[PDB]
Write a protein that binds this ligand. Structure first.
Ligand SMILES: O=P(O)(O)OC[C@H]1O[C@@H](n2cnc3c(-c4ccc5ccccc5c4)ncnc32)[C@H](O)[C@@H]1O
Ligand SMILES: O=P(O)(O)OC[C@H]1O[C@@H](n2cnc3c(-c4ccc5ccccc5c4)ncnc32)[C@H](O)[C@@H]1O
Ligand SMILES: [Ca+2]
Lengths: 136, 140
């Protein structure tokens, strides 16, 4: 099965955890979600970084929920771009916040895309994304 | 003259901007600081894609990357990720008095030599930068 790497804020703040839960659940339909407890309710920094970096290199796609600002999510995206990974970022404008110019500016609109969305449609958007370019 | 890349939160929040100006001012003692914008309208800057492209050019030019990582920020984390993949000399500065616990990805990326993370209190930041470059002078 293909491998997916999901990114979402933890020490940046866990406001969106229930949404991360939904996203991870839907991503699993398309392959193994290596990071499936960015979403765990009850949540060796070197060991964490090394295991995550192993996972990131094996991933066939990186999906990041980037509404909550987070050093770790940004770092994962930076490493992912340097690995030239396929990357999808998901951002919610209804938060009132404006997304980092660095993340929106890193997008090229094909291999690295940033999609604005509202919470209710996120499963349908993931379905759309992977039907247009399947992971094999 | 050596070049320095400074990272600090902007859209992650600007509460530490006056601290960023202090850090940028002190970094000028050691070479050219390429990113004074952190301590200083986005279409006036050329739009987000051109902001990203200019910063990445500067990051590749940099002889050292210094990041104030107390305020969580996607951009700062992204710059650090790109810097690690470029194998840059990296110093991160974090203030535990903020009340925060630093990202495990940033604390855990450190190896204690080429990528270091230093906990500090705001008053001493100039003396710590002096110490850092006195022990290991900046090479271009
Ligand atoms: O914490 P942030 O917001 O800077 O960064 C979050 C991002 O960075 C990765 N990350 C951050 N903290 C992580 C942890 C973690 C966090 C807190 C912990 C507390 C106690 C013990 C273990 C812990 C592990 N585990 C796995 N990945 C993590 C993660 O994949 C996520 O997408
Ligand atoms: O905005 P963040 O917190 O995700 O990321 C901040 C980091 O990412 C880089 N970065 C982020 N926004 C930047 C901008 C920029 C320029 C004009 C703007 C106008 C309005 C709002 C934001 C703007 C940002 N310029 C240059 N570098 C930027 C920067 O070097 C900094 O270290
Ligand atoms: Ca395919």
């Amino acid at each position: 099965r293909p491998a997916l790497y999901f990114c979402g804020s933890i020490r940046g703040g866990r406001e969106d955890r229930t949404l991360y839960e939904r996203i991870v659940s839907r991503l699993r339909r398309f392959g193994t979600v290596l990071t499936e407890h960015v979403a765990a309710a009850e949540l060796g920094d070197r060991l964490i970084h090394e295991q995550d970096l192993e996972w990131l290199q094996q991933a066939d796609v990186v999906v990041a929920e980037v509404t909550q600002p987070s050093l770790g999510v940004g770092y994962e995206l930076g490493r992912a771009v340097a690995f030239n990974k396929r990357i999808l970022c998901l951002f919610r404008p209804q938060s009132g916040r404006v997304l980092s110019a660095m993340i929106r500016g890193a997008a090229d609109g094909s291999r690295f895309q940033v999609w604005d969305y509202e919470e209710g449609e996120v499963e349908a958007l993931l379905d759309r994304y992977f039907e247009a370019d399947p992971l094999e």
